[PDB]
């Protein structure tokens, strides 16, 4: 349901997926430790550096 963003011609599916994941980590605040801990543990086990917004 990402239907509320006009298609700016310098993006791709990679960072709209990062944008959706950011939106979910801001939409579901009631348990937000577990969902940041989960995402960061999944990134670090794959060796992926963490975004400014996630930190």
């Amino acid at each position: 349901q990402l239907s509320s963003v006009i298609t700016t011609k310098e993006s791709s599916a990679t960072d709209e997926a990062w944008r959706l994941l950011s939106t979910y980590l801001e939409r579901y605040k009631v348990q937000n430790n577990l969902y940041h801990h989960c995402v960061i543990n999944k990134l670090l086990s794959h060796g992926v550096p963490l975004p400014n917004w996630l930190i």
Binding site: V5, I6, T8, E10, R19
Partner: protein, 323 residues
Amino acid sequence: FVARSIAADHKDLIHDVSFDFHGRRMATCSSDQSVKVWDKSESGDWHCTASWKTHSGSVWRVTWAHPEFGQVLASCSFDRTAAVWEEIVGESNDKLRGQSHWVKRTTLVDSRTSVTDVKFAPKHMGLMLATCSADGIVRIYEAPDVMNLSQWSLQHEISCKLSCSCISWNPSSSRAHSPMIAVGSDDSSPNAMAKVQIFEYNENTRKYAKAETLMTVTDPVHDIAFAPNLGRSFHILAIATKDVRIFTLKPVRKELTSSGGPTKFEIHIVAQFDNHNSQVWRVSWNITGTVLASSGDDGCVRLWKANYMDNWKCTGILKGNGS
């Protein structure tokens, strides 16, 4: 050059002036915490149509969007914020006497220090906005809608690692150069061997990569401007510092073995002019990028052009008489 004049009634020092895209409107901002909009009549006059408070600090710039996004203004401040403003027909409420029909749709707050410059992007990218600040960062924001100008996603933080004084977007609508931004620095340290840095949006890494840094600009920078592109295979860049400078930046064609990295430039200085005998405090180009203007502590706006041999010279001096 033929002059008309206007009493501007800002109640402290004015810091900036900017035209609309048609030259039918102009904006100005002050240490009195105000912005004003002035509009050019169907009789050749100019009238002040809005005059309102924008911020809590001194206002350090004012800038317009391109009119395919309507009538939108941005302003940056010493209170560490920037603000976005829309002109609205018919909203203006006598329930709150003396407010403007230029309404603040948002405030950006994420800079740790004074926001020194603000510039809207080349319209082909989207409704995008850049700001810079004395935390040594440039920040780039995107509106996902053109009507809901309250909502702006911060997409990039760009690390200069020196204080930021000014910024310039590259005016290339040509889909053979990737998106670019140049940044100037007010840093007075002798440790930072370069005061201008240049960044490229690299599709292969989706962040603003630092392509180049001008190792001949050892001295503090107050303003910076790319020249509008008449089809040129190379960019031109004006800088305001202890002197005026004009650089060329000509893209080095990648071999089919240098993937993933940014571009690189064959860079020259084409001109450097001391002739202000003083510091340079703005650099702005005519619509075709063929004439530069620059101001200094000599109380002169000086005009500069190429001759038919691309030898750049001074062509005019616009100066006060004090009568």
